PDB file of C-alpha atoms and ligand atoms in Angstrom:
ATOM      1  CA  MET T 578       0.094   0.398  -0.344  1.00  0.00           C
ATOM      2  CA  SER T 579       1.564   3.051  -1.297  1.00  0.00           C
ATOM      3  CA  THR T 580       2.059   6.209   0.165  1.00  0.00           C
ATOM      4  CA  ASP T 581      -1.114   9.236  -0.059  1.00  0.00           C
ATOM      5  CA  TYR T 582      -0.310  12.150   2.273  1.00  0.00           C
ATOM      6  CA  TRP T 583       2.284  14.712   2.664  1.00  0.00           C
ATOM      7  CA  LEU T 584       1.890  15.610   6.534  1.00  0.00           C
ATOM      8  CA  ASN T 585       4.233  19.879   6.404  1.00  0.00           C
ATOM      9  CA  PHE T 586       3.405  21.476   9.869  1.00  0.00           C
ATOM     10  CA  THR T 587       5.279  24.085  11.611  1.00  0.00           C
ATOM     11  CA  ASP T 588       4.306  26.665  14.013  1.00  0.00           C
ATOM     12  CA  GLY T 589       6.170  29.263  12.092  1.00  0.00           C
ATOM     13  CA  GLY T 590       9.214  29.591  14.036  1.00  0.00           C
ATOM     14  CA  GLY T 591      12.426  29.715  12.707  1.00  0.00           C
ATOM     15  CA  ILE T 592      12.954  27.825   8.291  1.00  0.00           C
ATOM     16  CA  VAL T 593      11.272  24.417   7.921  1.00  0.00           C
ATOM     17  CA  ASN T 594      11.916  24.372   3.642  1.00  0.00           C
ATOM     18  CA  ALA T 595       9.951  21.344   3.099  1.00  0.00           C
ATOM     19  CA  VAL T 596       9.872  19.516  -0.247  1.00  0.00           C
ATOM     20  CA  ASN T 597       7.186  17.036  -1.334  1.00  0.00           C
ATOM     21  CA  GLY T 598       9.103  14.650  -3.449  1.00  0.00           C
ATOM     22  CA  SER T 599       8.155  12.029  -5.868  1.00  0.00           C
ATOM     23  CA  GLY T 600       6.244   8.982  -4.281  1.00  0.00           C
ATOM     24  CA  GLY T 601       7.001   8.438  -0.994  1.00  0.00           C
ATOM     25  CA  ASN T 602      10.053  10.265  -1.033  1.00  0.00           C
ATOM     26  CA  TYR T 603      11.193  13.288   1.091  1.00  0.00           C
ATOM     27  CA  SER T 604      13.601  16.065   2.237  1.00  0.00           C
ATOM     28  CA  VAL T 605      14.227  18.386   4.934  1.00  0.00           C
ATOM     29  CA  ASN T 606      16.365  21.746   5.824  1.00  0.00           C
ATOM     30  CA  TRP T 607      15.025  23.267   8.954  1.00  0.00           C
ATOM     31  CA  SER T 608      16.628  25.735  11.009  1.00  0.00           C
ATOM     32  CA  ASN T 609      15.987  27.598  14.683  1.00  0.00           C
ATOM     33  CA  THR T 610      12.618  26.364  14.255  1.00  0.00           C
ATOM     34  CA  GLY T 611       9.526  26.392  16.837  1.00  0.00           C
ATOM     35  CA  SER T 612       7.922  22.881  17.041  1.00  0.00           C
ATOM     36  CA  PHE T 613       7.379  21.251  13.567  1.00  0.00           C
ATOM     37  CA  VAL T 614       7.087  18.090  12.023  1.00  0.00           C
ATOM     38  CA  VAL T 615       7.504  16.888   7.932  1.00  0.00           C
ATOM     39  CA  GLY T 616       6.529  13.822   6.060  1.00  0.00           C
ATOM     40  CA  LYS T 617       4.991  11.071   3.594  1.00  0.00           C
ATOM     41  CA  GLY T 618       2.933   9.031   4.751  1.00  0.00           C
ATOM     42  CA  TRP T 619      -0.402   7.587   4.972  1.00  0.00           C
ATOM     43  CA  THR T 620      -5.000   9.607   5.272  1.00  0.00           C
ATOM     44  CA  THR T 621      -6.013   7.165   6.924  1.00  0.00           C
ATOM     45  CA  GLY T 622      -3.074   4.321  10.397  1.00  0.00           C
ATOM     46  CA  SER T 623      -3.489   1.510  10.675  1.00  0.00           C
ATOM     47  CA  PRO T 624      -2.570  -0.928  13.539  1.00  0.00           C
ATOM     48  CA  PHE T 625      -1.328  -3.747  11.537  1.00  0.00           C
ATOM     49  CA  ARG T 626       0.427  -1.424   9.169  1.00  0.00           C
ATOM     50  CA  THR T 627       4.512  -3.014   8.402  1.00  0.00           C
ATOM     51  CA  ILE T 628       5.927   0.884   7.422  1.00  0.00           C
ATOM     52  CA  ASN T 629       9.292   0.624   5.704  1.00  0.00           C
ATOM     53  CA  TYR T 630      11.575   3.871   5.011  1.00  0.00           C
ATOM     54  CA  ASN T 631      14.692   5.052   3.839  1.00  0.00           C
ATOM     55  CA  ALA T 632      16.407   7.764   5.979  1.00  0.00           C
ATOM     56  CA  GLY T 633      19.235   8.895   3.460  1.00  0.00           C
ATOM     57  CA  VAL T 634      19.957  11.898   4.931  1.00  0.00           C
ATOM     58  CA  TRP T 635      19.821  12.000   8.556  1.00  0.00           C
ATOM     59  CA  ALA T 636      22.129  15.278  10.275  1.00  0.00           C
ATOM     60  CA  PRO T 637      19.848  16.377  13.494  1.00  0.00           C
ATOM     61  CA  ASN T 638      21.033  19.146  15.774  1.00  0.00           C
ATOM     62  CA  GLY T 639      18.864  19.369  19.064  1.00  0.00           C
ATOM     63  CA  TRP T 640      14.893  18.047  19.733  1.00  0.00           C
ATOM     64  CA  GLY T 641      14.670  17.206  15.839  1.00  0.00           C
ATOM     65  CA  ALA T 642      13.553  13.461  15.875  1.00  0.00           C
ATOM     66  CA  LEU T 643      13.225  10.332  12.743  1.00  0.00           C
ATOM     67  CA  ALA T 644       9.740   9.276  13.780  1.00  0.00           C
ATOM     68  CA  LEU T 645       6.458   7.163  12.839  1.00  0.00           C
ATOM     69  CA  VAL T 646       3.713   9.483  13.536  1.00  0.00           C
ATOM     70  CA  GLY T 647       0.178   9.565  13.993  1.00  0.00           C
ATOM     71  CA  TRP T 648      -3.053  10.289  15.483  1.00  0.00           C
ATOM     72  CA  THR T 649      -6.018   8.989  16.579  1.00  0.00           C
ATOM     73  CA  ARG T 650      -9.678  10.221  17.686  1.00  0.00           C
ATOM     74  CA  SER T 651     -11.680   8.821  19.861  1.00  0.00           C
ATOM     75  CA  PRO T 652     -10.089   9.184  22.227  1.00  0.00           C
ATOM     76  CA  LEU T 653      -7.646  11.811  21.099  1.00  0.00           C
ATOM     77  CA  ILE T 654      -4.325  10.112  20.876  1.00  0.00           C
ATOM     78  CA  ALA T 655      -0.903  11.254  20.014  1.00  0.00           C
ATOM     79  CA  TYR T 656       1.403   8.432  18.895  1.00  0.00           C
ATOM     80  CA  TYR T 657       6.366   7.943  18.436  1.00  0.00           C
ATOM     81  CA  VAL T 658       7.786   4.966  16.694  1.00  0.00           C
ATOM     82  CA  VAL T 659      11.385   7.259  17.611  1.00  0.00           C
ATOM     83  CA  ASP T 660      13.720   5.581  15.967  1.00  0.00           C
ATOM     84  CA  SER T 661      16.908   8.213  15.610  1.00  0.00           C
ATOM     85  CA  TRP T 662      17.511  11.832  17.132  1.00  0.00           C
ATOM     86  CA  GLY T 663      19.974  14.426  17.427  1.00  0.00           C
ATOM     87  CA  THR T 664      20.121  15.546  21.189  1.00  0.00           C
ATOM     88  CA  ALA T 665      16.847  14.444  23.665  1.00  0.00           C
ATOM     89  CA  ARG T 666      16.448  13.534  27.259  1.00  0.00           C
ATOM     90  CA  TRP T 667      13.576  11.463  27.165  1.00  0.00           C
ATOM     91  CA  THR T 668      11.608  11.337  30.139  1.00  0.00           C
ATOM     92  CA  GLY T 669       7.968  10.568  31.446  1.00  0.00           C
ATOM     93  CA  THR T 670       5.815   7.853  32.936  1.00  0.00           C
ATOM     94  CA  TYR T 671       7.627   4.792  31.802  1.00  0.00           C
ATOM     95  CA  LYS T 672       5.600   1.516  31.146  1.00  0.00           C
ATOM     96  CA  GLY T 673       8.213  -0.722  29.776  1.00  0.00           C
ATOM     97  CA  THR T 674       9.863  -1.882  26.845  1.00  0.00           C
ATOM     98  CA  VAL T 675       9.571  -3.871  23.659  1.00  0.00           C
ATOM     99  CA  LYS T 676      11.678  -5.822  21.029  1.00  0.00           C
ATOM    100  CA  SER T 677      10.731  -4.498  17.234  1.00  0.00           C
ATOM    101  CA  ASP T 678      12.363  -4.885  14.023  1.00  0.00           C
ATOM    102  CA  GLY T 679      16.178  -5.541  15.397  1.00  0.00           C
ATOM    103  CA  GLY T 680      15.550  -2.886  18.260  1.00  0.00           C
ATOM    104  CA  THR T 681      14.701  -2.536  22.107  1.00  0.00           C
ATOM    105  CA  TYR T 682      12.004   0.595  22.316  1.00  0.00           C
ATOM    106  CA  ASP T 683      11.041   2.330  26.260  1.00  0.00           C
ATOM    107  CA  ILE T 684       7.741   2.813  26.072  1.00  0.00           C
ATOM    108  CA  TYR T 685       6.365   6.384  27.861  1.00  0.00           C
ATOM    109  CA  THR T 686       3.434   8.063  28.133  1.00  0.00           C
ATOM    110  CA  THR T 687       2.607  11.897  28.207  1.00  0.00           C
ATOM    111  CA  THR T 688      -0.230  14.269  28.961  1.00  0.00           C
ATOM    112  CA  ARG T 689      -0.888  17.733  27.063  1.00  0.00           C
ATOM    113  CA  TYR T 690      -3.164  20.119  27.792  1.00  0.00           C
ATOM    114  CA  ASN T 691      -3.398  23.661  26.012  1.00  0.00           C
ATOM    115  CA  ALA T 692      -1.840  22.717  22.987  1.00  0.00           C
ATOM    116  CA  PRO T 693      -1.988  22.155  18.684  1.00  0.00           C
ATOM    117  CA  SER T 694      -3.214  19.136  17.309  1.00  0.00           C
ATOM    118  CA  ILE T 695      -5.107  17.668  14.781  1.00  0.00           C
ATOM    119  CA  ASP T 696      -8.589  19.036  16.329  1.00  0.00           C
ATOM    120  CA  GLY T 697      -7.201  22.711  16.768  1.00  0.00           C
ATOM    121  CA  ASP T 698      -4.332  24.966  18.096  1.00  0.00           C
ATOM    122  CA  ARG T 699      -5.629  24.256  22.508  1.00  0.00           C
ATOM    123  CA  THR T 700      -6.185  20.852  22.707  1.00  0.00           C
ATOM    124  CA  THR T 701      -5.755  18.187  25.361  1.00  0.00           C
ATOM    125  CA  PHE T 702      -4.121  14.774  24.821  1.00  0.00           C
ATOM    126  CA  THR T 703      -2.803  11.678  25.841  1.00  0.00           C
ATOM    127  CA  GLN T 704       1.417  10.895  23.669  1.00  0.00           C
ATOM    128  CA  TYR T 705       1.971   6.950  23.255  1.00  0.00           C
ATOM    129  CA  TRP T 706       5.916   7.003  23.274  1.00  0.00           C
ATOM    130  CA  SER T 707       8.339   3.846  21.813  1.00  0.00           C
ATOM    131  CA  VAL T 708      11.990   5.304  21.643  1.00  0.00           C
ATOM    132  CA  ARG T 709      14.370   3.348  20.757  1.00  0.00           C
ATOM    133  CA  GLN T 710      17.672   2.680  23.355  1.00  0.00           C
ATOM    134  CA  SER T 711      20.031   2.826  20.928  1.00  0.00           C
ATOM    135  CA  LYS T 712      19.554   5.734  17.400  1.00  0.00           C
ATOM    136  CA  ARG T 713      18.836   3.226  14.681  1.00  0.00           C
ATOM    137  CA  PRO T 714      21.246   3.289  11.639  1.00  0.00           C
ATOM    138  CA  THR T 715      19.806   5.379   8.580  1.00  0.00           C
ATOM    139  CA  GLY T 716      20.774   5.075   4.950  1.00  0.00           C
ATOM    140  CA  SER T 717      18.926   1.440   4.293  1.00  0.00           C
ATOM    141  CA  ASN T 718      15.681   0.026   4.710  1.00  0.00           C
ATOM    142  CA  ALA T 719      14.480  -0.305   7.747  1.00  0.00           C
ATOM    143  CA  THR T 720      11.122  -1.527   8.811  1.00  0.00           C
ATOM    144  CA  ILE T 721       8.944  -0.347  12.122  1.00  0.00           C
ATOM    145  CA  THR T 722       5.478  -3.600  12.483  1.00  0.00           C
ATOM    146  CA  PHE T 723       3.778  -0.775  14.465  1.00  0.00           C
ATOM    147  CA  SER T 724       1.369  -3.941  15.298  1.00  0.00           C
ATOM    148  CA  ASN T 725       4.258  -4.913  17.973  1.00  0.00           C
ATOM    149  CA  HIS T 726       3.980  -1.714  19.432  1.00  0.00           C
ATOM    150  CA  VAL T 727       0.381  -1.812  18.872  1.00  0.00           C
ATOM    151  CA  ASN T 728       0.197  -4.364  21.118  1.00  0.00           C
ATOM    152  CA  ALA T 729       3.618  -3.379  23.576  1.00  0.00           C
ATOM    153  CA  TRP T 730       1.416  -0.745  24.553  1.00  0.00           C
ATOM    154  CA  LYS T 731      -1.733  -1.922  24.595  1.00  0.00           C
ATOM    155  CA  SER T 732      -0.452  -4.551  27.693  1.00  0.00           C
ATOM    156  CA  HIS T 733       0.704  -1.652  29.394  1.00  0.00           C
ATOM    157  CA  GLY T 734      -3.003   0.056  29.478  1.00  0.00           C
ATOM    158  CA  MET T 735      -2.421   2.214  26.234  1.00  0.00           C
ATOM    159  CA  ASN T 736      -5.250   1.816  24.086  1.00  0.00           C
ATOM    160  CA  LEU T 737      -5.536   3.141  21.381  1.00  0.00           C
ATOM    161  CA  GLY T 738      -9.108   5.250  20.147  1.00  0.00           C
ATOM    162  CA  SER T 739     -11.151   4.294  17.359  1.00  0.00           C
ATOM    163  CA  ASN T 740     -10.190   6.438  14.692  1.00  0.00           C
ATOM    164  CA  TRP T 741      -7.590   6.331  13.005  1.00  0.00           C
ATOM    165  CA  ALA T 742      -6.260   9.806  11.533  1.00  0.00           C
ATOM    166  CA  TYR T 743      -2.569   9.957   9.325  1.00  0.00           C
ATOM    167  CA  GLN T 744       0.269   8.289   9.626  1.00  0.00           C
ATOM    168  CA  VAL T 745       3.576   8.865   9.010  1.00  0.00           C
ATOM    169  CA  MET T 746       7.293   8.709   9.069  1.00  0.00           C
ATOM    170  CA  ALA T 747       7.884  11.767   9.885  1.00  0.00           C
ATOM    171  CA  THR T 748      11.188  14.419  10.739  1.00  0.00           C
ATOM    172  CA  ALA T 749       9.678  16.163  13.804  1.00  0.00           C
ATOM    173  CA  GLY T 750      11.559  19.073  15.774  1.00  0.00           C
ATOM    174  CA  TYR T 751      11.307  21.282  18.533  1.00  0.00           C
ATOM    175  CA  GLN T 752      14.007  23.800  18.266  1.00  0.00           C
ATOM    176  CA  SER T 753      16.931  22.379  16.309  1.00  0.00           C
ATOM    177  CA  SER T 754      18.366  22.413  13.118  1.00  0.00           C
ATOM    178  CA  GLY T 755      19.576  20.033  10.740  1.00  0.00           C
ATOM    179  CA  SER T 756      18.539  18.126   7.558  1.00  0.00           C
ATOM    180  CA  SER T 757      16.889  15.363   6.519  1.00  0.00           C
ATOM    181  CA  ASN T 758      15.931  13.418   3.096  1.00  0.00           C
ATOM    182  CA  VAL T 759      13.470   9.841   3.874  1.00  0.00           C
ATOM    183  CA  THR T 760      11.786   7.634   1.522  1.00  0.00           C
ATOM    184  CA  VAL T 761       8.604   5.595   3.182  1.00  0.00           C
ATOM    185  CA  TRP T 762       6.251   2.771   2.151  1.00  0.00           C
TER     186      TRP T 762
HETATM  187  C1  7V7 N1432       8.549  10.955  26.171  1.00  0.00           C
HETATM  188  C2  7V7 N1432       8.734  12.084  25.445  1.00  0.00           C
HETATM  189  C3  7V7 N1432       9.608  13.315  25.949  1.00  0.00           C
HETATM  190  O1  7V7 N1432      10.706  12.887  26.925  1.00  0.00           O
HETATM  191  N1  7V7 N1432       9.347  14.446  25.995  1.00  0.00           N
HETATM  192  C4  7V7 N1432       8.284  14.987  25.776  1.00  0.00           C
HETATM  193  C5  7V7 N1432       7.141  15.545  25.994  1.00  0.00           C
HETATM  194  C6  7V7 N1432       5.898  16.086  25.828  1.00  0.00           C
HETATM  195  C7  7V7 N1432       6.078  16.106  23.790  1.00  0.00           C
HETATM  196  C8  7V7 N1432       6.988  16.251  23.308  1.00  0.00           C
HETATM  197  C9  7V7 N1432       8.036  15.394  23.622  1.00  0.00           C
HETATM  198  C10 7V7 N1432       9.774  15.716  27.381  1.00  0.00           C
HETATM  199  C11 7V7 N1432       9.605  15.937  28.510  1.00  0.00           C
HETATM  200  C12 7V7 N1432      10.620  17.116  29.198  1.00  0.00           C
HETATM  201  N2  7V7 N1432      10.624  18.425  28.506  1.00  0.00           N
HETATM  202  C13 7V7 N1432      11.605  19.083  29.306  1.00  0.00           C
HETATM  203  C14 7V7 N1432      12.249  20.077  28.938  1.00  0.00           C
HETATM  204  C15 7V7 N1432      12.463  21.289  30.043  1.00  0.00           C
HETATM  205  C16 7V7 N1432      13.950  20.742  30.183  1.00  0.00           C
HETATM  206  C17 7V7 N1432      14.615  22.050  31.935  1.00  0.00           C
HETATM  207  C18 7V7 N1432      14.086  23.252  31.802  1.00  0.00           C
HETATM  208  C19 7V7 N1432      12.581  22.720  31.396  1.00  0.00           C
HETATM  209  C20 7V7 N1432      11.521  22.554  30.367  1.00  0.00           C
HETATM  210  C21 7V7 N1432      11.127  17.796  27.069  1.00  0.00           C
HETATM  211  C22 7V7 N1432      10.347  17.011  26.353  1.00  0.00           C
HETATM  212  C1  7V7 N1433       9.645  18.262  22.743  1.00  0.00           C
HETATM  213  C2  7V7 N1433       9.308  17.926  22.017  1.00  0.00           C
HETATM  214  C3  7V7 N1433       8.400  18.231  20.403  1.00  0.00           C
HETATM  215  O1  7V7 N1433       7.700  19.195  21.233  1.00  0.00           O
HETATM  216  N1  7V7 N1433       7.785  17.856  18.957  1.00  0.00           N
HETATM  217  C4  7V7 N1433       8.945  16.503  18.825  1.00  0.00           C
HETATM  218  C5  7V7 N1433       8.217  15.533  19.210  1.00  0.00           C
HETATM  219  C6  7V7 N1433       8.419  13.762  19.004  1.00  0.00           C
HETATM  220  C7  7V7 N1433      10.130  13.999  18.894  1.00  0.00           C
HETATM  221  C8  7V7 N1433      10.306  15.403  18.347  1.00  0.00           C
HETATM  222  C9  7V7 N1433       9.830  16.696  18.401  1.00  0.00           C
HETATM  223  C10 7V7 N1433       7.220  18.952  18.785  1.00  0.00           C
HETATM  224  C11 7V7 N1433       5.153  17.853  18.574  1.00  0.00           C
HETATM  225  C12 7V7 N1433       4.279  18.016  18.521  1.00  0.00           C
HETATM  226  N2  7V7 N1433       4.454  17.910  17.140  1.00  0.00           N
HETATM  227  C13 7V7 N1433       3.851  18.905  16.429  1.00  0.00           C
HETATM  228  C14 7V7 N1433       1.802  17.724  16.382  1.00  0.00           C
HETATM  229  C15 7V7 N1433       0.778  18.256  15.207  1.00  0.00           C
HETATM  230  C16 7V7 N1433       0.854  18.048  14.546  1.00  0.00           C
HETATM  231  C17 7V7 N1433      -0.525  17.983  13.354  1.00  0.00           C
HETATM  232  C18 7V7 N1433      -1.357  19.647  13.772  1.00  0.00           C
HETATM  233  C19 7V7 N1433      -0.867  20.136  14.982  1.00  0.00           C
HETATM  234  C20 7V7 N1433       0.105  19.322  16.080  1.00  0.00           C
HETATM  235  C21 7V7 N1433       6.058  18.642  16.216  1.00  0.00           C
HETATM  236  C22 7V7 N1433       6.595  17.853  17.054  1.00  0.00           C
HETATM  237 CL1   CL N1434       4.897  14.739  16.129  1.00  0.00          CL
HETATM  238  K1    K N1435       6.035  14.796  -5.159  1.00  0.00           K
HETATM  239  K1    K N1436      14.280   0.520  30.085  1.00  0.00           K
END
């Protein structure tokens, strides 16, 4: 199932020059950013999708991350499977680990309020995280078997909503700079 969605969002801070490439490819060059997310993916996420990507350029600085990102509604939940990043001190509620796709991931949950979401500029939502314990090598084909994460989260009481919104292999950042180029299928 080929990608059919182009995510390109920023809060307006700094520069986020995002390029909608051929098929599932995209490029990002960013500097002195506020909050942003960019990437190719799917209009409707699925808990059964296996996501393939190749991040041919990955050079983040600060809290810039290479991650599967997506949302559900009912309830409103943002989720993250983080494979690499620049500098990022992960902290919060911690639920265990999951092994997937040759790596081990730390599981976190966080809450946001008065915060931007796909529902508006000042909303409340929960965030589910799988954060790889070591940064994943980039430049070769990589898989994220997302059902492994959904199921691990489920086993710790982190259930996703029933209405699936976008699901993107993204470059996401906050107060960050860098360069990335990723193909997604
Ligand atoms: C598991 C995810 C995660 O770890 N986080 C997170 C939470 C929500 C949304 C995005 C990322 C961090 C939580 C803690 N903050 C510390 C920031 C800070 C440091 C020093 C003084 C004042 C503030 C940074 C983000
Ligand atoms: C402290 C880290 C941080 O703040 N972030 C982050 C999270 C994970 C990995 C790297 C950076 C941001 C979290 C929020 N998203 C925007 C959410 C959104 C999407 C669509 C419409 C409206 C809002 C951008 C990145
Ligand atoms: Cl995001
Ligand atoms: K294009
Ligand atoms: K751990």
